[PDB]
Amino acid sequence: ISTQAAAELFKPVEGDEPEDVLFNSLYNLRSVELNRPAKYNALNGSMIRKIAPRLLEWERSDMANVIVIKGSGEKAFCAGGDVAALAKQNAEGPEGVKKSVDYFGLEYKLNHLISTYTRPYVAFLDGITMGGGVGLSIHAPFRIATERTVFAMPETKIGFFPDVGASFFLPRMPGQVGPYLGLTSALLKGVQVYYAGIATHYLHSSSLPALESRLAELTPRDYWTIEQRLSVINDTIEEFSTGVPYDENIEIGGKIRLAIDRCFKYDKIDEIIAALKEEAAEGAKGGVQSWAKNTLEELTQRSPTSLHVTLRQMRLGKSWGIAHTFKREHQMAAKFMKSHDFNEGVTALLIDKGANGPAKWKPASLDEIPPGANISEDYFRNDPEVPVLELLNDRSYMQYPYNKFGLPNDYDVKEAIEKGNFTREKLIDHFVETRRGKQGVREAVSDVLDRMAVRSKGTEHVQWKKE
Amino acid sequence: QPVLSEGSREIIYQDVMEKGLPIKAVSAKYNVDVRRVAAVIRLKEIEKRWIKEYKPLARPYARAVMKMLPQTVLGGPDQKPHESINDVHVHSYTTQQLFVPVSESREFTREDAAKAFGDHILPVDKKLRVPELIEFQKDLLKEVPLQEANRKFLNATAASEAKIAEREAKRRQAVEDAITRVKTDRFEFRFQEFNAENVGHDGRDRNAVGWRYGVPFPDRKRSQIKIPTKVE
Amino acid sequence: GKGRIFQAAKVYQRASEAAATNIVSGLPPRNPPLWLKAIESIPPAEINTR
Amino acid sequence: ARYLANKRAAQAPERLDEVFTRATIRESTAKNTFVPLDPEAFVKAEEARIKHA
Amino acid sequence: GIQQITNMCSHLQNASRARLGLTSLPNTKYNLALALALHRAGFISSITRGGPHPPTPEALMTYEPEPVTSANVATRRLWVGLKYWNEEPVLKELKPISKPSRLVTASLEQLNRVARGFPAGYMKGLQLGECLFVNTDRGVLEVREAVERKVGGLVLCKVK
Amino acid sequence: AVVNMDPAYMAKYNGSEQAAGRGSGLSEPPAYEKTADEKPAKQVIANPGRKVPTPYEQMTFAPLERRLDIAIFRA
Amino acid sequence: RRPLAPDLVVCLNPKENMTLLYECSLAKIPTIGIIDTNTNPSWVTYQIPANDDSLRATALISGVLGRAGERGQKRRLEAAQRGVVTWKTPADVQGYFELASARAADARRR
Amino acid sequence: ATLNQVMRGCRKPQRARHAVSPALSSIKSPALKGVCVKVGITRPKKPNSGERKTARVRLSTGKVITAYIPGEGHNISQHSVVLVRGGRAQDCPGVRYHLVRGALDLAGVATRMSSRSKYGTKKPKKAS
Amino acid sequence: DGLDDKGQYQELKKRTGMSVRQILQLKTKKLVHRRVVNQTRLGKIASDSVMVIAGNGDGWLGLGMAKSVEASIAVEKATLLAIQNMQPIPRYENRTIYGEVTTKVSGTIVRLNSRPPGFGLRVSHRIFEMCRAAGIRDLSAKFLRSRNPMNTVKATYQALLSQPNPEDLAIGRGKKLVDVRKVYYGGSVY
RNA sequence: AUAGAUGAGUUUGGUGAUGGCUCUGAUUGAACACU
RNA sequence: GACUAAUUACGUGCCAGCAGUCGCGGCAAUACGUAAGAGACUAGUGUUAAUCAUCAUAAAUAGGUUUAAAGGGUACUCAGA
Ligand SMILES: [K+]
Ligand SMILES: [K+]
Ligand SMILES: [K+]
Ligand SMILES: [Mg+2]
Ligand SMILES: [Mg+2]
Ligand SMILES: [Mg+2]
Ligand SMILES: [Mg+2]
Ligand SMILES: [Mg+2]
Ligand SMILES: [Mg+2]
Ligand SMILES: [Mg+2]
Ligand SMILES: [Mg+2]
Ligand SMILES: [Mg+2]
Ligand SMILES: [Mg+2]
Ligand SMILES: [Mg+2]
Incomplete structure (x- = not known):
């Protein structure tokens, strides 16, 4: 896409505020500050039409060597998207329903660009990050969390389905956490986002201004591979680490983590809830009864259609490509505008501000949906009316090229054991040495060895429990 | 540097005269400068005159001198091009050191470079003596058959020579329309017309017609050219 | 000026250029210092900026 | 012909690549040059008279 | 008045010579024009008008200044963010050309010649890195921005 | 002086790559790193033979070559 | 061969000895120093703002840098046992090899 | 100086320098004829010692x-x-001032072989 | 090969690390030759302060100064001291300097301008020796205030090391500094 | 009209400055001397 | 002699003389006068006078004034900037 084509595709449609996003350029650093603190920097049409030209333009030059996206306020980075407006437009006939589909087109176009960006992309998660704000960071190789970070996807509560590229991400995460975070719409605060795996680094909010100054000093050579450029930044972001809290323990770990892998491995919501009921039932061996009971209360308070549809793509999104995912999500989200749950949930929650009581999904509960009925299939059939989404480029892949910057997950610990003879204590030192003192590596690796590691041959060797 | 062999000069002569090929094509074919191709024809024409008038040529001197200079026989056995046919004069404006501050992501092209050097300057794409080559090379980038690429080249060059001849024809025909030839008993008076009001705004103009008033004879100045400057 | 011209912030720049080409024009430049590649991707921090 | 060309260049749109690669200067600073009279001037004077008294 | 631009040019030299991060300037319609030019050319970091104390550095661009009424116009001031790279200031010299004692004006034919390293009038050719700012009816443009717009006028300062 | 410019480069490229980077052109690794590398880097895009210096010094007595008597001696 | 020069100096009291740091910048050598509140930060390449008058902080900073070198030396030796040298012959010693072949070439012919 | 002080005529010509031969420089003449009034010997000053052959001359001007x-x-x-x-x-x-040696009455050196032009000596004409 | 039969380049052969045959291929010239004198308790003691430039012809130049009672020995000191002080000098298209430079050394100011190709070294005699030795071929210098032989050489040598770096100015301003001459000719015409 | 901007000798026991003098370039409606 | 391309011998001995500037000559003078050689221009070659430039050496472009030429004894103030 040339400058003229891009500039002509993102024309400043009437109503676009002039200073929605604030751009700045230092030496080697290009920044993008979402300037809408009143509404928690909520993404919308006007905001997306100002970022796409810049990102495309900054990708043609070799001067811009580091891209940084951040929020303007001190509470939120990008809390959701313009869900409220979509609902109104959806209630004005087909002409108004296609406007919403066009908005999702822009968002997916941007997310794909950020994911297939040819330059280092950093995102300061200094504040709550939900909905649209989850699409500007997850696909980046550097996602800096802070004390104020609050991660969640409260989209299944409004009838919608997590879709800012989540289908590519969540599936390909360690364990069944990705579905859990989507279906349950859990709330992760502070360092828990770092341990979970969403974020790559964890710095204090006060040390972000001094990080930008350093990122500007970095001047890479034109012959350095994309890997080298990322390595330099990764080592630079670790220079400002103040250390994870001393008291806060891994939230989703140990028992709770094991319970997630035992209740989020099936392909039917009915089976999943059936498993949770067992854990909730007193005397369960797991010891997660409290968590189990609490989880059910939240699962029985969301649109049943979204649950079925959401879980459906978690199993199908593990094989799609990033480019194919966005194209499908567009058609997928286009049918949600015509659905009744979405138009109802949004209006009854955000619009009404919770007045008139709880929302009223078209199916009252999962029990109403008979077993032999599959409602998921209908959405996963692109219609000819909605044209296929046209991305800004052709770059694609099956798995994230450089998503190794974060804390070691099960995939890393597993690989290490299958290529070495480390012990219980000697294996931890291996990862602490390779990462040279990354905060939380000793704790994270220890947790992995407390869930999928057995003392098969004593202290001499360590093997996985699966076998 | 090598010199066109005797047999080579004839090949260039026959191509232009017998086959009536455009000079630009013959130059691009054998990698010979258009200024040299035109000279070989002029020199060869004089030879035809000498042979037609039964004049003795300097064959003993020609053969002896040709063995002391490197030669480039054209045709089948062509190893290297005779010379560069794309040399562009280094204009004085283009020799300056200019670092123009532009946007970090700007696509600065030769067109923009010409405008930075000056306002009336052209890019090197228009200063070539055979500009049709660029158009011919653009066809090879579009996977156009070589045979058709040469066809377009010939037509382009051939069409260009027609325009040049037309302009030259109109010019000479328009220059003879201003001259009135009045034959007399002894001579033929040639009265040329011209606008007597084109003397600039202060009377000083280079292309004016008349002996200037207010100038003393400069015969006493140093380095005063008093020799013919051109032979027509 | 009782001080002296310190250039500790430009050791890489100066050294990198000196190791670009050889002093004997028409030869491959000899191997650079061992430290030139170590601090290649670690530029110094900005100083003296109130 | 020369007058239109010159008038067309002085009223031409800024280059696109120079619009997408410039730090954003807030409008409040770069365009609010007008200095209006204080709307609360009358209340302040009436309140300042008592204080001085 | 042109005396303001001269004071502004001299001040930015001293501020950069002292290696300061921020710099204050009297809030005037003229100073702002030249400041935007320096920013549009890449010499200064940011421009924000505020009170006698500098705004919150962390939120410089997010800083929302209050309206400039006749009740506080006397305390308003322009805060410029100086730029330094490679242990060297980016705004080293700001020699002025049009002083209060004489307003030097240049034509389009002279600016074209000065923008290629050739003297013309009371000016000198521009060398590598140097830059000239001319105040015209189209604002305080750069010599190369005024050449593409085919204008001329008052020459403010030569930026090296 | 003159400069040779082949039409091949003219067609493909329009001189935009000569400004990539910071204006002077995309930098390339030094000569001491290349020898260690097994595979050589891609060649830079430019006209053929566009780095040799032109001998201006050896043109002082060019005006004498226009003399009619010197031109005969050179023939 | 002429004597060696340090490829990196780690000073713990730049304020005291400025003659060493000046020779490093004069000979194009990087340096590391503990810059206090009254020490000129332009003397060393990499500053470490801290208290230099404390024998307890100096031991900590030096210890951390010591472990850095130790960890670095470990990787180098681990890469040398795999036939992967992380450094090429210096220019000085490199010249000797060239001269060695020249002297050896004579023996081949003669 | 300020631009105002220059409108008032502060840039005056530099103080003239005395010429080497004022009598000639005044009227722009390369030489002048004069009737010798006295033929004497002048003595050099601090560094030099000897006897110079000067002559008091009354130029045509007076x-x-x-x-x-x-x-x-x-x-x-x-x-x-x-x-x-x-x-x-x-x-x-x-x-x-000096005196031309091939002048009206002053005769050039007859025994001069080198730099005769400076002393007004015809060629010896040994063979001719 | 018996070239150094005086023991003068043996020490220099270690610092710079190159054969004597390559040391003798450098362009050396004595620019300044003063006759200084110091009044002491034993009468006047005259010395010969000399300045020698050791050039490469392809971008490297070095300035050395030394004094001694003997003029011949003073020239060897500056030569050895100048061959080891060689530094790379940036030069646009390997023929001229970047832009313009103005260096001041205690009352001696030198202004060097970058001239187009085919301009020649229209400079003074001392600058010519340095430009001819460093590898420059087109330059236009000027002594604005004073013409001290020594400071003239120090100021102009310090000016060739203070040329504006077009790449540092670009990263500083965030703007490209494109050489129009290179884009126009599709390369660098040396 | 875009190639056009240049120095040298001489103050001091010595160095760096200030500041003149002189030479280096071009020329004449020129004179004189030797030709 | 150096500036300024180009050397020895003899004669003279602060004498005779050369000299644009610095200077040379007091008994083995590369500087004076002869001889030879060398460097260079050439039907012209030198010298004298004058002009521009050198000279930012009256500086509008474009200077300077603590110790080097040069801040008024002072500041209220008309004109004027
Ligand atoms: K924030
Ligand atoms: K003297
Ligand atoms: K007085
Ligand atoms: Mg201390
Ligand atoms: Mg003789
Ligand atoms: Mg002076
Ligand atoms: Mg004294
Ligand atoms: Mg001589
Ligand atoms: Mg004589
Ligand atoms: Mg005297
Ligand atoms: Mg003699
Ligand atoms: Mg004649
Ligand atoms: Mg006083
Ligand atoms: Mg008085």
Whole structure:
């Protein structure tokens, strides 16, 4: 896409505020500050039409060597998207329903660009990050969390389905956490986002201004591979680490983590809830009864259609490509505008501000949906009316090229054991040495060895429990 | 540097005269400068005159001198091009050191470079003596058959020579329309017309017609050219 | 000026250029210092900026 | 012909690549040059008279 | 008045010579024009008008200044963010050309010649890195921005 | 002086790559790193033979070559 | 061969000895120093703002840098046992090899 | 100086420098004829020692100047019409002119072989 | 090969690390030759302060100064001291300097301008020796205030090391500094 | 009209400055001397 | 002699003389006068006078004034900037 084509595709449609996003350029650093603190920097049409030209333009030059996206306020980075407006437009006939589909087109176009960006992309998660704000960071190789970070996807509560590229991400995460975070719409605060795996680094909010100054000093050579450029930044972001809290323990770990892998491995919501009921039932061996009971209360308070549809793509999104995912999500989200749950949930929650009581999904509960009925299939059939989404480029892949910057997950610990003879204590030192003192590596690796590691041959060797 | 062999000069002569090929094509074919191709024809024409008038040529001197200079026989056995046919004069404006501050992501092209050097300057794409080559090379980038690429080249060059001849024809025909030839008993008076009001705004103009008033004879100045400057 | 011209912030720049080409024009430049590649991707921090 | 060309260049749109690669200067600073009279001037004077008294 | 631009040019030299991060300037319609030019050319970091104390550095661009009424116009001031790279200031010299004692004006034919390293009038050719700012009816443009717009006028300062 | 410019480069490229980077052109690794590398880097895009210096010094007595008597001696 | 020069100096009291740091910048050598509140930060390449008058902080900073070198030396030796040298012959010693072949070439012919 | 002080005429011409031969420089003449008034010997100053062959001459204008006689031996006496050219005997205060040797009455050195043009000596004509 | 039969380049052969045959291929010239004198208790003691430039012809130049009672020995000191002080000098298209430079050394100011190709070294005699030795071929210098032989060489040598770096100015301003001459000719015409 | 901007000798026991003098370039409606 | 391309011998001995500037000559003078050689221009070659430039050496473009030429004894103030 040339400058003229891009500039002509993102024309400043009437109503676009002039200073929605604030751009700045230092030496080697290009920044993008979402300037809408009143509404928690909520993404919308006007905001997306100002970022796409810049990102495309900054990708043609070799001067811009580091891209940084951040929020303007001190509470939120990008809390959701313009869900409220979509609902109104959806209630004005087909002409108004296609406007919403066009908005999702822009968002997916941007997310794909950020994911297939040819330059280092950093995102300061200094504040709550939900909905649209989850699409500007997850696909980046550097996602800096802070004390104020609050991660969640409260989209299944409004009838919608997590879709800012989540289908590519969540599936390909360690364990069944990705579905859990989507279906349950859990709330992760502070360092828990770092341990979970969403974020790559964890710095204090006060040390972000001094990080930008350093990122500007970095001047890479034109012959350095994309890997080298990322390595330099990764080592630079670790220079400002103040250390994870001393008291806060891994939230989703140990028992709770094991319970997630035992209740989020099936392909039917009915089976999943059936498993949770067992854990909730007193005397369960797991010891997660409290968590189990609490989880059910939240699962029985969301649109049943979204649950079925959401879980459906978690199993199908593990094989799609990033480019194919966005194209499908567009058609997928286009049918949600015509659905009744979405138009109802949004209006009854955000619009009404919770007045008139709880929302009223078209199916009252999962029990109403008979077993032999599959409602998921209908959405996963692109219609000819909605044209296929046209991305800004052709770059694609099956798995994230450089998503190794974060804390070691099960995939890393597993690989290490299958290529070495480390012990219980000697294996931890291996990862602490390779990462040279990354905060939380000793704790994270220890947790992995407390869930999928057995003392098969004593202290001499360590093997996985699966076998 | 090598010199066109005797047999080579004839090949260039026959191509232009017998086959009536455009000079630009013959130059691009054998990698010979258009200024040299035109000279070989002029020199060869004089030879035809000498042979037609039964004049003795300097064959003993020609053969002896040709063995002391490197030669480039054209045709089948062509190893290297005779010379560069794309040399562009280094204009004085283009020799300056200019670092123009532009946007970090700007696509600065030769067109923009010409405008930075000056306002009336052209890019090197228009200063070539055979500009049709660029158009011919653009066809090879579009996977156009070589045979058709040469066809377009010939037509382009051939069409260009027609325009040049037309302009030259109109010019000479328009220059003879201003001259009135009045034959007399002894001579033929040639009265040329011209606008007597084109003397600039202060009377000083280079292309004016008349002996200037207010100038003393400069015969006493140093380095005063008093020799013919051109032979027509 | 009782001080002296310190250039500790430009050791890489100066050294990198000196190791670009050889002093004997028409030869491959000899191997650079061992430290030139170590601090290649670690530029110094900005100083003296109130 | 020369007058239109010159008038067309002085009223031409800024280059696109120079619009997408410039730090954003807030409008409040770069365009609010007008200095209006204080709307609360009358209340302040009436309140300042008592204080001085 | 042109005396303001001269004071502004001299001040930015001293501020950069002292290696300061921020710099204050009297809030005037003229100073702002030249400041935007320096920013549009890449010499200064940011421009924000505020009170006698500098705004919150962390939120410089997010800083929302209050309206400039006749009740506080006397305390308003322009805060410029100086730029330094490679242990060297980016705004080293700001020699002025049009002083209060004489307003030097240049034509389009002279600016074209000065923008290629050739003297013309009371000016000198521009060398590598140097830059000239001319105040015209189209604002305080750069010599190369005024050449593409085919204008001329008052020459403010030569930026090296 | 003159400069040779082949039409091949003219067609493909329009001189935009000569400004990539910071204006002077995309930098390339030094000569001491290349020898260690097994595979050589891609060649830079430019006209053929566009780095040799032109001998201006050896043109002082060019005006004498226009003399009619010197031109005969050179023939 | 002429004597060696340090490829990196780690000073713990730049304020005291400025003659060493000046020779490093004069000979194009990087340096590391503990810059206090009254020490000129332009003397060393990499500053470490801290208290230099404390024998307890100096031991900590030096210890951390010591472990850095130790960890670095470990990787180098681990890469040398795999036939992967992380450094090429210096220019000085490199010249000797060239001269060695020249002297050896004579023996081949003669 | 300020632009105002220059409108008032603060840029005046530099103070003139005295010429080497004022009598000639004044009227822009390369030489002048004069009747010799006295033929004497002037003495050099601090560094130099010897006896210079000067001559008090009364130029056509009327000024009475002291010239210098270059060469070995002269042929002029009282009331001798001699041609005076510019110059100066550096080590002789008051002598700021020379005398052409091939002049009206002053005869060139007859025993001069080198630099005859400077002393007005015809070629020996040994063979011719 | 018996070239150094005086023991003068043996020490220099270690610092710079190159054969004597390559040391003798450098362009050396004595620019300044003063006759200084110091009044002491034993009478006047005259010395010969000399300045020698050791050039490469392809971008490297070095300035050395030394004094001694003997003029011959003073020249060897500056030569050895100048061959080891060689530094790379940036030069646009290997023929001229970048832009313009103005260096001041205690009352001696030198202004060097970058001239187009085919301009020649229209400079003074001392600058010519340095430009001819460093590898420059087109330059236009000027002594604005004073013409001290020594400071003239120090100021102009310090000016060739203070040329504006077009790449540092670009990263500083965030703007490209494109050489129009290179884009126009599709390369660098040396 | 885009190639056009240049120095040298001489103050001091010595160095760096200030500041003149002189030479280096071009020329004449020129004179003179030797030709 | 150096500036300034180009050397020895003899004669003279602060004498005779050369000299644009610095200077040379007091008994083995590369500087004076002869001889030879060398460097260079050439039907012209030198010298004298004058002009521009050198000279930012009256500086509008474009200077400077603590110790080097040069801040008024002072500041209220008309004109004027
Ligand atoms: K924030
Ligand atoms: K003297
Ligand atoms: K007085
Ligand atoms: Mg201390
Ligand atoms: Mg005297
Ligand atoms: Mg003789
Ligand atoms: Mg002076
Ligand atoms: Mg004294
Ligand atoms: Mg000589
Ligand atoms: Mg004589
Ligand atoms: Mg003699
Ligand atoms: Mg004649
Ligand atoms: Mg006083
Ligand atoms: Mg008085």
